[PDB]
Amino acid sequence: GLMQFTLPVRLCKEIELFHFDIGPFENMWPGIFVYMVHRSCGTSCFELEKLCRFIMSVKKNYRRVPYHNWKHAVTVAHCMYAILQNNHTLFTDLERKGLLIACLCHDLDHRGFSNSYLQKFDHPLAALYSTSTMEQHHFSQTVSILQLEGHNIFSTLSSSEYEQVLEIIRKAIIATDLALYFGNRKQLEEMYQTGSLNLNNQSHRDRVIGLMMTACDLCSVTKLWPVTKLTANDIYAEFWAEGDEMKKLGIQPIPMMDRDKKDEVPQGQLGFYNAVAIPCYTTLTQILPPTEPLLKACRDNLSQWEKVIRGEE
């Protein structure tokens, strides 16, 4: 009832900042997430015994892959927490509630392979879900954990609030499909610039929550350089394993996934910052001005990749 979660001082302060790293102590990550729900949503959003049981089933359903693991789930939710705390009054009670959960769940049961590798391997999930294959699976796994006994953290919501919150979570998780990001950002750019962007238009809110989801999902490019650079090793560890598997199916993988083309990593990061990360955080900053630190941190890391190329590290 009167049972606040507290963090040591350095964490209590740094968790409010966009560039926070949740640290290497896995056993503190659930405490961090509950702390964020309590401050973002209130101590009354969720029955604590249910939330804790839900967090631990979510954790169990993430796998020990190098990048798309439980640490990423909690990192992406912390970024969403920072956006919600710096844009307090722009979001409904239900949006606050759905989005942190969506972020914790957005990569449930990921195997460390792209939608592309599933389709070329001809994985059962690719016939059940022809587009956003893994992302429809992540949502399906979320609804499964919600229907386990003692796990329905949304039990107190009305029939119709429950359905809105599962619909916010479904669109939030689908939007983490980066193939959908490009179109969704282009539309958001045009609506903002011609002045048509309207946050009372539910289809516009959808778009805006989708862009936040892409921003939170890519938030490793907004950390301090030593965090960003070591995360790149985890990311390439998956991409190269998928490369290996492509070659096993008789297919030349794209260079990004070819461990034989390691040399050209720095130049490939530039591509990614310019083609994906910078545009994402630019459009997000225009629509939500208090998210600017994400843009500035991204630009700092692009500039660190330029330095890697010029032999200066």
Ligand X SMILES: Cn1cc(-c2ccccc2)nc1C#Cc1ccc2nc(C3CC3)c(CO)n2n1
**What contacts 24+ positions apart, CB below 8 Å, involve 72-76?**
72/107, 73/103, 73/104, 73/105, 73/106, 73/107, 74/22, 74/29, 74/32, 74/33, 74/104, 75/21, 75/22, 75/219, 75/220, 76/103, 76/104, 76/106, 76/107, 76/216, 76/217, 76/219
Q: Among residues 41 and 216, whose Cβ is nearest to ligand X?
A: 216
Q: Is 107 in the site for Zn ion (CB under 5 A)?
A: yes
Q: Among residues 95 and 234, whose Cβ is nearest to ligand X?
A: 234
At its nearest, how many Å lie between ligand X and the CB of residue 255?
4
What is the rounded distance in angstroms from the CA atom of residue 142 to the CA atom of residue 144? 5
260 annotated to bind ligand: no
Counted residue by residue, the chain has a size of: 313
**Which does residue 95 touch among ligand X, Mg ion, Zn ion, none (CB within 5 to 8 A, set by kind)?**
none
Helix (H) or strand (E) holding 259: none
Q: Among residues 141 and 301, whose Cβ is nearest to Mg ion?
A: 141
147 annotated to bind ligand: no
Q: Among residues 208 and 280, whose Cβ is nearest to ligand X?
A: 280
Site for Zn ion in 9-48 (CB under 5 A): none
What is the rounded distance in angstroms from the CA atom of residue 194 to the CA atom of residue 88? 26
Q: Is 177 in the site for Zn ion (CB under 5 A)?
A: no
What is the rounded distance in angstroms from the CA atom of residue 273 to the CA atom of residue 283? 14
At its nearest, how many Å lie between ligand X and the CB of residue 107?
11
78 annotated to bind ligand: no
Q: Which residues, in sequence order, are CB contacts of 28 under 8 Å at separation 6+?
A: 22
The site for ligand X (CB under 6 A) is made up of 218, 220-221, 231-232, 235, 255-256, 261, 264-265, 268, 271-272
At its nearest, how many Å lie between ligand X and the CB of residue 169?
21
Q: Among residues 221 and 297, whose Cβ is nearest to ligand X?
A: 221
Where does this chain touch Zn ion (CB under 5 A) — which range of 48-56, 91-99, 215-223, 251-259? 215-223
Instruction: List the one residue out of 156, 261, 276, 5 whose CA is nearest residue 15.
Output: 5
Tell me which of 95, 135, 217, 242 binds Zn ion, using CB under 5 A: 217
The angle subtended at Cα 208 by Cα 207 and Cα 210, nearest 5°, is 65
What is the rounded distance in angstroms from the CA atom of residue 13 to the CA atom of residue 165? 30
Phi, psi of 69, rounded to the nearest 5 degrees: -130, -175
C-alpha R_g of the chain: 19
**Which does residue 285 touch among Mg ion, ligand X, Zn ion, none (CB within 5 to 8 A, set by kind)?**
none
Phi, psi of 45, rounded to the nearest 5 degrees: -55, -45
**Which does residue 183 touch among Mg ion, ligand X, Zn ion, none (CB within 5 to 8 A, set by kind)?**
none
234 annotated to bind ligand: no
**Which does residue 268 touch among Zn ion, ligand X, Mg ion, none (CB within 5 to 8 A, set by kind)?**
ligand X
Q: Among residues 131 and 196, whose Cβ is nearest to Mg ion?
A: 131
Q: Which residues form the catalytic set?
A: 68
**Which does residue 301 touch among ligand X, Zn ion, Mg ion, none (CB within 5 to 8 A, set by kind)?**
none
Q: What is the dihedral of CA 31, 301, 280, 230, to 10 degrees?
A: -50
Helices 159-175 and 93-105, packing angle to 10 deg = 50
**Which does residue 166 touch among Mg ion, ligand X, Zn ion, none (CB within 5 to 8 A, set by kind)?**
none
The site for Mg ion (CB under 5 A) is made up of 107, 176
Binding-site sequence positions for 3',5'-cyclic GMP: 68, 269
- Binding-site residues sit at 68, 72, 106-107, 217, 269
